Design a protein around this ligand. Structure first.
Ligand SMILES: CCCCCCCCCCCCCCCCCC(=O)OC[C@H](COP(=O)([O-])OCC(O)COP(=O)([O-])OC[C@@H](COC(=O)CCCCCCCCCCCCCCCCC)OC(=O)CCCCCCCCCCCCCCCCC)OC(=O)CCCCCCCCCCCCCCCCC
Ligand SMILES: CCCCCCCCCCCCCCCCCC(=O)OC[C@H](COP(=O)(O)OCCN)OC(=O)CCCCCCCCCCCCCCCCC
Ligand SMILES: CCCCCCCCCCCCCCCCCC(=O)OC[C@H](COP(=O)(O)OCCN)OC(=O)CCCCCCCCCCCCCCCCC
Ligand SMILES: CCCCCCCCCCCCCCCCCC(=O)OC[C@H](COP(=O)(O)OCCN)OC(=O)CCCCCCCCCCCCCCCCC
Ligand SMILES: CCCCCCCCCCCCCCCCCC(=O)OC[C@H](COP(=O)(O)OCCN)OC(=O)CCCCCCCCCCCCCCCCC
Ligand SMILES: CCCCCCCCCCCCCCCCCC(=O)OC[C@H](COP(=O)(O)OCCN)OC(=O)CCCCCCCCCCCCCCCCC
Ligand SMILES: CCCCCCCCCCCCO[C@@H]1O[C@H](CO)[C@@H](O[C@H]2O[C@H](CO)[C@@H](O)[C@H](O)[C@H]2O)[C@H](O)[C@H]1O
Ligand SMILES: CCCCCCCCCCCCO[C@@H]1O[C@H](CO)[C@@H](O[C@H]2O[C@H](CO)[C@@H](O)[C@H](O)[C@H]2O)[C@H](O)[C@H]1O
Ligand SMILES: CCCCCCCCCCCCO[C@@H]1O[C@H](CO)[C@@H](O[C@H]2O[C@H](CO)[C@@H](O)[C@H](O)[C@H]2O)[C@H](O)[C@H]1O
Ligand SMILES: CCCCCCCCCCCCO[C@@H]1O[C@H](CO)[C@@H](O[C@H]2O[C@H](CO)[C@@H](O)[C@H](O)[C@H]2O)[C@H](O)[C@H]1O
Ligand SMILES: CCCCCCCCCCCCO[C@@H]1O[C@H](CO)[C@@H](O[C@H]2O[C@H](CO)[C@@H](O)[C@H](O)[C@H]2O)[C@H](O)[C@H]1O
Ligand SMILES: CCCCCCCCCCCCO[C@@H]1O[C@H](CO)[C@@H](O[C@H]2O[C@H](CO)[C@@H](O)[C@H](O)[C@H]2O)[C@H](O)[C@H]1O
Ligand SMILES: Nc1nc2c(ncn2[C@@H]2O[C@H](COP(=O)(O)OP(=O)(O)OP(=O)(O)O)[C@@H](O)[C@H]2O)c(=O)[nH]1
Ligand SMILES: [Mg+2]
Lengths: 320, 345, 19, 64, 48, 54, 98, 459
């Protein structure tokens, strides 16, 4: 019985499910600041579900067979090409950023739907609230146009307010000279071309916009690297937060109900990212658009709705 | 809103027209008009933003003023005849004031300027309710007194509504306005034939309802308010283009679709009464509907407008809509002309 | 040649408040 | 491409009514049509006149 | 399995299938019985 | 003839006329104050029309 | 600029299949489509359709009417009657206005 | 007719249920076998028309048109097969469906026994045709051509619907036999003059009459090939078929009400023929050729004489096959150089000697070379128009001279002179393209040997 009004009226109510660790935690920070390790041990220690950072292929791996799709089906953007040529006139940069917001917006709905349906908490590396730091970095370095920034703020204005914010924000402060070194000892040839002036702009947006914006609704924890390098120290800091501010206080069964109808309906989640605003960066002509759409529908298990694909071994179709 | 509120509010919305439709007394007919006016208001303004509040306000002051005028007719008539129903002997001016007030409640032009705006400020499903279910109560009153209505007032209102609905809809890029002006034009057809054959007003209402319902359901599938929003349907729900196009041609009265039947039978019955001039202008301005319905068809099914990158995520996901009612109403609203003799009588 | 399909300029004429 | 486009898709946008165009179109449009109307109407009136007074020789004519 | 997220329509809703088929059989049997009861009533009322 | 005056007279003037009307009757200010003021004119015209038919 | 495919190029239909008939890109489907058109188009319709039309008899009474006109032109010439009367309907049956 | 209609309704399930590699073979095979069955209508051994039921019935006017429709469906499928090879499967089956739907309606349109049934079917053809021109047309102007085609028809067709309703509200029925055997002379009052125009303007627009013809050169110049084939061969003849059918109930007002339209046709045809001399687009040259031929058909129907009807029926069938053959030939070049300009490609006889023979034979049919049925029409229309008045020979003499010039100028320009040698993509003619021309030309030659089959009602 798909969740709906009749499911709620018969007993499926969120407020029963919640306990002290039914929280949304987002680990933030710069590039190579240890978010992967720290977010993975916060979740394991607290019994929370870990959501690895949403990337180009986030929605490929949550649908179908979970295998990455050819890059034309999955956003037609490249992180590697962003670092090799951040000002290419093929609109890669803002195409990458606009795609990354949408995938993060979807992961947030996936995370929230898990929280509200089971009571288990979630830990996310970055989210839709910190996503803008990367956009602001691009624009300061001239990697996108002012119109691209308007189109981002428009989509954000139409999607972010619909959702509850994180209970806790765990920023990890790493200075750029140390960050730039970590990227160099990481290995990826492309990621080593990042300018330090771009890294600094990611750090400025974080401290001048993200953290002051979130302290008004969330418990924010700022750890220098050495404080974060022992995750058990951070988790003991999380077990004792009080959570005495933000929208989560004013929530009841029927505010949650309508948020759960929003986040289980992924086309409703993504609806406003597709508004017909015609930036050349993200607009696609019908020829290319129709070629892609048709090729995608000939993929194994993508031709019909899940459960009606005889190719991938579905059964009882003539009765479903 | 919690389930108690929905049960109370949705029951009252349903209750109103049933009270107006089942009532012998005029004051109980008025009471049903009040139930509909009061209970729809919370539904319209549910999202609570600057636009739905203006929409729910413009609607209230329009429909309350029209209610008071209807009540004056019901009361001047009780003074004249000591009865709570309109008689053949009811004063002529009492009937005309009822007609103008009810047309103000239906949205018939020239009392129409409120309808396109109210439909614009409210969510799609409440536009469906407002443009469909909410029309039955005022119309059921009118069909009960069709021997009495002055045809000159009725035909001037119908001619006006067909013209204004055509001209208004020709300039609109917002789908919700295109649906309101669509409504205004069709009410012109229902009203034009009212004093002659009220059965054809019910046929034109029913065919309009089963065409307007799936059309809203089609826009509610992707929440598409503009012509550019609906142009992305080829890359979102391409399976929908076959039936959106027919329904739009069907709403346009084009043969051999069910929507030709209402216009064709109304014209036929109007000329049984020698209503040649009015009938000719009505059919000649219904052509303008087909033009801006055709323009919509051009933008959606007969061409492919540019699409955006983020729509690729939309395709990876799975939709649970539309329901079994959309398909049933789509087929019946387009492929039922060969059953015409079973619909008129 | 190839079938003409609407471009950005064509679609921007339905983008206003009125037609 | 420019030549064929200049001679079809580009004529009307670059047409402005003037006294010389309007007279030319009026004469070109209805000039010949009025001329022929009187040739045929005059001829067939002389033909209908001569059949009422029997002054025609439709001697072997049996197909029309 | 193939899908990471198990489909809602993973297997038939046997309740709906039997109910869906049940109504159809009932309506044909009721329809056909009604028709015969009308042809008999029609004939009987009219002397045939 | 064909490319110019036959366009101008029939299809072009018909589209010009109806575009002209849809422009006059659709540019409303959205003010309930003005709408009711027109609803007031409508009511008086019906009163006047019925008056001269008594 | 916007994302858009480049225009597909000018292919030679005979490059890969020198016996291309014009119907299909697949040779086997292609020949059987040519064969069907020639058989149903020329061997069946044009041949039999032409034959069936040549042996429709007495088409629109073009033949009966001649056979009957000869019968009447004989009968009337021997019996001294006019070959064809001026009036069609007998003047007896026509009551004129007075 | 239900044995011509029901099997045709089955080409729609057969289109969708066939394999991807069998759709084009299967449907085009059964379309031929359907046009064979329609020959049964020709079994007319008597002077009584075939009445099959209360709905359908075939006459000597509706039988040639019915057969021409059924034979044209397989032709259009083969015409549409090479420019749709790049579309996915559902688009091809959706194109085949729109062409079949146009054949089913057209057959019902000519076999209908009642005017209201004719009107609805006569309006339903806009849907598949609007979809074809707009969805599958090539240039940006296809959108403006769909509007011009849709609303010229609809504006004319609303008054016809009014007039048809008035006829039934007065006579009680719209059956064509009853209206024939109970027709009463109309008074010459100013109301019946308008009833006449109401009943006629719908069909005079579809011909099209001169003046209100700008929809046709727009529609043709942008429709896909099968859009032009059906338009030039059948849809224009809906106008002619309607006027013949409904003009029985309009007497005697046709003796004077027709003057404005005899004059627009006789003068209009000279204006359109002379346009073809200076028309820079090949597909446009043919479309104006159609307008100038239908002018004679309009003029001959307006005078209602046994010869004039006989000439118009022959010219309707002759023009149906000839204009379609021309559009297919112009398409054959267009599917190689993707340009409609007539002067761009020249000297094509050097590399397409056989296709240059079909050009010559189509061109000779267009300029009405004896004994082709194209001349029989032109000749019997002239004979009747001469008896109507003797000075019409002046205008028909001119139009015959101009018709020779633009027919040969069409052949001399594209097939002769030096080859435009830069056109290295001039592939050899397909077997499919040549069969398409043989299928147009062979019937045209066969009908010349047996003209009796297309004399119409009067003869
Ligand atoms: C169909 C089955 C028959 C087989 C056809 C065949 O195999 O032709 C091969 C034959 C030789 O093969 P080819 O070398 O490829 O020739 C094509 C060349 O490219 C070039 O071909 P071509 O130009 O050498 O031959 C085509 C010829 C046109 O076709 C002809 O051969 C002329 C036959 C008369 C038609 O062109 C003309 O000369 C036009 C003639 C105009 C006739 C003027 C007089 C008309 C009035 C008289 C007729 C009425 C009489 C009534 C009595 C009273 O070519 C043709 O005959 C043309 C094929 C198309 C048939 C044309 C129509 C006839 C059918
Ligand atoms: C019991 C639940 C009410 C019936 C219902 O569900 O109607 C559909 C609609 C809610 O729809 P939804 O939230 O998508 O999921 C419903 C799952 N049954 O439910 C509603 O819209 C509310 C229906 C209220 C009107 C019914 C009045 C009941 C009094 C008799
Ligand atoms: C006389 C009736 C006139 C029609 C009045 C409309 C009544 C329905 C009101 C409404 O809200 O329509 C939308 C309704 C909601 O259903 P849905 O779109 O599937 O989304 C929520 C379900 N989970 O979706 C629907 O189911 C609309 C069905 C309309 C039924 C029309 C029957 C005629
Ligand atoms: C549908 C049936 C179609 C078939 C009927 C066609 C028959 C007519 C064919 C010949 C028409 C000759 C017209 C020549 C072309 C004139 C033209 O198109 O110019 C357009 C011109 C625009 O001028 P404008 O100043 O903008 O109008 C006032 C708005 N401010 O002018 C205008 O558009 C403004 C016109 C305003 C006056 C309109 C008169 C209405 C009177 C109604 C009385 C009832
Ligand atoms: C009962 C009517 C006749 C039934 C038989 C029609 C089908 C004949 C078999 C067939 O499908 O033809 C196959 C042919 C090409 O397809 P393929 O299977 O690849 O052949 C390979 C040979 N090397 O493709 C074809 O030729 C299909 C042609 C079908 C034409 C319809 C025949 C209708 C006969 C009149 C009834
Ligand atoms: C050698 C040609 C031949 O067979 O000629 C004989 C016959 C003509 O003889 P016939 O007219 O009957 O004699 C009457 C008095 N001499 O000629 C004929 O009867 C053949 C008639 C051909 C009929 C056409 C066959 C169908 C072709 C598909 C039709 C496509 C064209 C659509 C127009 C149809 C109009 C009928
Ligand atoms: C939709 C039509 C079908 C349903 C028909 C109507 C019967 C509905 C039965 C289910 C009723 C559930 O409705 C019940 O409403 C009450 C108020 O009345 C809500 O309760 C509300 O008020 C209580 C008061 O103590 C507080 O906890 C809080 O302010 C809020 O939760 C419940 O959260 C909901 O469970
Ligand atoms: C005898 C009693 C008769 C009872 C009659 C009941 C009639 C049926 C009413 C159906 C109402 C449900 O229909 C309505 O669905 C729409 C979606 O389309 C939801 O509407 C939704 O709109 C958008 C997106 O769709 C969301 O952002 C919004 O928050 C949500 O409200 C409504 O929350 C729900 O109320
Ligand atoms: C009276 C005659 C009957 C008239 C019937 C009306 C038929 C419908 C006409 C409107 C056109 C339908 O609209 C048509 O939708 C189909 C699929 O639905 C689209 O089909 C194409 O695109 C979609 C995705 O974009 C793919 O799923 C499909 O495989 C592809 O071929 C066409 O691009 C569109 O043109
Ligand atoms: C006697 C009865 C015959 C009456 C026939 C009346 C037919 C009416 C046809 C309606 C035509 C509508 O015409 C509509 O406007 C113009 C007409 O030029 C076209 O528009 C075209 O020309 C205009 C110039 O004015 C440009 O602005 C536009 O970019 C171009 O496409 C539209 O694309 C078409 O949609
Ligand atoms: C009684 C009814 C009989 C008439 C039937 C109705 C036929 C339709 C005619 C009215 C609609 C045509 O309206 C016609 O729309 C075209 C569309 O290009 C407008 O033309 C417009 O084109 C484009 C996009 O629309 C704009 O960028 C441009 O600036 C503007 O000129 C014309 O200015 C108008 O004349
Ligand atoms: C631009 C569109 C043009 C519209 C064209 C519509 C077709 C024109 C129809 C002819 C005009 C109306 O034709 C009209 O017929 C009606 C009855 O039907 C008759 O008119 C009369 O009818 C009856 C008597 O018969 C009287 O009681 C009545 O008072 C009067 O209307 C006359 O015959 C003529 O006035
Ligand atoms: N332009 C852009 N790049 C992004 C965005 N999110 C991630 N990236 C890039 O994708 C990579 C993601 O890896 P990160 O998580 O940020 O850094 P890391 O190496 O994984 O180190 P930790 O995750 O903290 O453990 C980084 O190189 C980022 O540059 C984004 O929203 N916009
Ligand atoms: Mg990562």
């Amino acid at each position: 019985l798909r969740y709906g009004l009749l499911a709620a009226i018969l007993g499926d109510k969120t407020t029963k499910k919640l306990h002290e660790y039914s929280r949304v935690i987002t680990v933030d920070g710069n590039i190579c600041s240890g978010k992967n390790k720290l977010a993975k041990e916060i979740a394991q220690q607290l019994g929370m579900k870990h959501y690895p950072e949403a990337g180009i292929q986030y929605s490929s791996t949550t649908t179908g067979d979970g295998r990455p799709l050819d890059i034309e089906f999955s956003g037609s953007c490249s992180l590697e090409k962003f670092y090799d040529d951040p000002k290419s006139n093929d609109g890669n940069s803002y195409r990458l950023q606009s795609w990354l917001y949408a995938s993060r917006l979807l992961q947030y709905a996936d995370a929230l739907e898990h929280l509200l349906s089971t009571g288990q908490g979630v830990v996310l590396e970055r989210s839709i609230y910190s996503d803008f730091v990367f956009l602001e970095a691009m624009y300061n370095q001239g990697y996108i146009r002012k119109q691209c920034v308007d189109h981002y703020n428009e989509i954000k204005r139409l999607t972010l307010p619909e959702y509850l914010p994180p209970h806790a924000v765990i920023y990890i402060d790493v200075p750029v000279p140390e960050v730039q070194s970590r990227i160099q000892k990481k290995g990826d040839p492309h990621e080593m071309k990042v300018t330090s002036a771009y890294l600094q702009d990611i750090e400025n947006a974080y401290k001048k916009t993200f953290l002051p914006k979130m302290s008004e609704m969330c418990e924010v924890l700022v750890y220098d690297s050495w404080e974060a390098e022992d995750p058990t120290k951070v988790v003991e800091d999380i077990e004792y937060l009080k959570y005495n501010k933000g929208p989560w206080l004013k929530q009841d069964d029927w505010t949650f109900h309508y948020l759960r109808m929003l986040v289980q309906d992924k086309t409703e989640v993504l609806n406003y990212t597709t508004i017909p605003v015609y930036l050349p960066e993200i607009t696609i002509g019908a020829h290319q658009g129709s070629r892609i759409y048709n090729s995608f529908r000939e993929l194994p298990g993508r031709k019909y709705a899940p459960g009606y694909n005889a190719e991938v071994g579905d059964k009882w179709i003539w009765l479903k | 809103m919690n389930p108690i509120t929905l049960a109370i509010i949705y029951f009252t919305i349903f209750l109103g027209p049933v009270i107006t439709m089942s009532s012998t007394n005029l004051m109980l007919m008025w009471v049903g008009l009040e139930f509909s006016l009061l209970a729809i208001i919370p539904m319209l303004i549910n999202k609570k933003n600057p636009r739905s509040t203006e929409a729910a306000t413009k609607y209230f002051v329009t429909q309350a003023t029209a209610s008071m005028i209807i009540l004056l007719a019901i009361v001047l008539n009780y003074k004249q005849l000591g009865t709570w129903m309109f008689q053949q002997q009811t004063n002529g001016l009492i009937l005309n004031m009822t007609l103008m007030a009810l047309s103000m409640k239906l949205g018939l032009a020239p009392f129409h300027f409120w309808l396109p705006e109210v439909t614009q400020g409210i969510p799609l499903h409440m536009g469906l309710i407002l443009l469909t279910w909410q029309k039955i109560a005022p119309l059921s009153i009118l069909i009960q007194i069709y021997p009495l209505l002055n045809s000159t007032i009725i035909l001037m209102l119908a001619i006006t509504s067909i013209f204004m609905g055509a001209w208004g809809g020709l300039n609109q890029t917002q789908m919700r306005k295109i649906m309101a002006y669509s409504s205004i034009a069709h009410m012109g057809w229902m009203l034009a034939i009212l004093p002659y054959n009220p059965s054809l007003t019910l046929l034109n209402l029913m065919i309009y309802i089963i065409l307007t319902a799936p059309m809203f359901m089609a826009l509610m599938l992707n929440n598409s308010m503009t012509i550019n929003s609906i142009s992305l349907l080829w890359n979102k729900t391409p399976a929908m283009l076959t039936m959106i196009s027919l329904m739009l041609l069907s709403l346009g009265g084009l043969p051999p679709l069910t929507g030709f039947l209402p216009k064709w039978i109304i014209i036929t019955e109007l000329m049984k009464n020698n209503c040649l001039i009015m009938a000719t202008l009505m059919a000649m301005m219904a052509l303008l509907n087909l033009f801006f319905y055709t323009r919509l068809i051009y933008s959606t099914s007969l061409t492919m407008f540019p699409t955006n990158n983020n729509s690729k995520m939309m395709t990876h996901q799975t939709k649970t809509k539309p329901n079994l009612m959309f398909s049933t109403l789509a087929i019946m609203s387009t492929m039922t002309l060969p059953l015409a003799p079973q619909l008129i009588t | 040649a190839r079938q003409w399909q609407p471009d950005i300029e064509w679609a921007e004429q339905f983008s206003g408040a009125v037609m | 491409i420019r030549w064929t486009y200049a001679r079809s898709a580009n004529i009307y946008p670059n047409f402005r009514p003037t006294p010389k165009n309007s007279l030319l179109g009026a004469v070109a449009g209805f000039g010949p049509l009025i001329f022929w109307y009187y040739v045929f109407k005059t001829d067939r009136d002389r033909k209908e006149r001569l059949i009422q007074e029997g002054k025609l020789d439709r001697k072997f004519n049996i197909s029309y | 399995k193939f899908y990471v997220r198990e489909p809602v329509n993973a297997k038939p809703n046997w309740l709906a299938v039997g109910l869906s088929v049940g109504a159809s059989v009932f309506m044909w049997i009721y329809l056909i019985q009604t028709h015969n009861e009308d042809v008999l009533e029609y004939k009987r009322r009219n002397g045939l | 003839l064909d490319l110019i005056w036959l366009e101008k007279t029939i299809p072009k003037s018909t589209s010009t006329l109806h575009t002209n009307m849809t422009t006059l009757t659709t540019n409303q200010k959205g003010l309930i104050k003005l709408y009711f003021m027109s609803f007031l004119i409508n009511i008086i015209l019906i009163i006047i029309l019925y008056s001269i038919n008594l | 600029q916007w994302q858009e495919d480049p225009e597909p190029e000018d292919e030679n239909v005979y490059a890969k299949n020198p016996d291309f008939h014009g119907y299909d890109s697949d040779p086997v489907v292609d020949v059987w489509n040519m064969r069907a058109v020639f058989f149903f188009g020329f061997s069946i319709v044009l041949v039999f359709g032409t034959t069936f039309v040549a042996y429709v008899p007495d088409y629109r009474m073009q033949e009966w009417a001649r056979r009957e006109a000869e019968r009447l032109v004989k009968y009337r010439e021997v019996n001294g009657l006019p070959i064809m009367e001026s009036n069609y309907f007998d003047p007896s049956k026509i009551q004129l206005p007075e | 007719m239900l044995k011509i209609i029901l099997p045709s309704l089955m080409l729609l399930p057969l289109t969708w249920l066939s394999s991807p590699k069998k759709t084009w073979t299967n449907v085009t095979s059964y379309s031929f076998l359907i046009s064979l069955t329609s020959l049964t209508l020709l079994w007319q051994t008597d002077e009584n028309y075939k009445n099959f039921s209360n709905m359908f019935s075939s006459d000597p006017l509706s039988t040639p048109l019915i057969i021409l429709t059924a034979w044209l469906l397989p032709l259009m499928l083969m015409a549409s097969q090479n420019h749709l090879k790049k579309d996915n499967n559902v688009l091809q089956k959706l194109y085949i469906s729109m062409l079949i739907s146009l054949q089913i309606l057209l057959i019902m349109t000519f076999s209908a026994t009642e005017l209201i049934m004719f009107y609805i079917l006569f309006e339903a053809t806009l849907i598949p045709t609007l979809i074809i021109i707009t969805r599958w047309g090539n240039q940006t102007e296809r959108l403006n051509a769909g509007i011009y085609f849709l609303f010229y028809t609809l504006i004319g067709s609303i008054p016809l619907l009014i007039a048809l309703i008035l006829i039934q509200n007065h006579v009680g029925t719209l059956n064509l036999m009853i209206l024939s055997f109970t027709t009463h002379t109309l008074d010459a009052s100013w109301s019946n003059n308008l009833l006449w125009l109401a009943c006629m303007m719908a069909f005079l627009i579809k011909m099209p009459l001169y003046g209100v013809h700008l929809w046709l050169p727009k529609a043709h110049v942008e429709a896909p090939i099968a859009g032009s084939m059906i338009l030039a061969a059948i849809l224009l003849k809906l106008g002619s078929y309607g006027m013949i059918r409904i003009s029985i109930i309009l007497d005697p007002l046709t003796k004077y009400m027709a003057y404005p339209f005899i004059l627009l046709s006789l003068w209009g045809m000279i204006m359109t023929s002379s346009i073809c001399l200076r028309q820079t687009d090949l597909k446009s040259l043919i479309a104006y050729s159609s307008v100038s031929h239908m002018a004679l058909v309009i003029a001959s129907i307006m005078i209602q004489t046994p010869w004039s009807f006989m000439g118009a029926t022959m010219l309707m069938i002759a023009h149906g096959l000839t204009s379609s053959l021309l559009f297919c030939l112009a398409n054959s070049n267009y599917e190689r150089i993707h340009s409609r300009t007539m002067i761009m490609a020249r000297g094509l006889q050097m590399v397409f000697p056989l296709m240059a023979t079909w050009w010559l034979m189509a061109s000779l049919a267009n300029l009405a070379l004896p004994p082709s049925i194209n001349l029989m029409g032109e000749l019997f229309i002239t004979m009747s128009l001469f008896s109507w008045s003797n000075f019409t020979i002046i205008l028909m003499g001119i139009n015959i001279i101009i018709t020779g010039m633009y027919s040969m100028y069409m052949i001399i320009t594209t097939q002769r002179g030096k080859l435009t040698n830069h056109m290295i993509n001039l592939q050899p003619s397909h077997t499919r393209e040549l069969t398409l021309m043989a299928l147009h030309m062979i019937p045209l030659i066969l009908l010349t040997t047996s003209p009796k089959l297309i004399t119409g009602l009067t003869m």
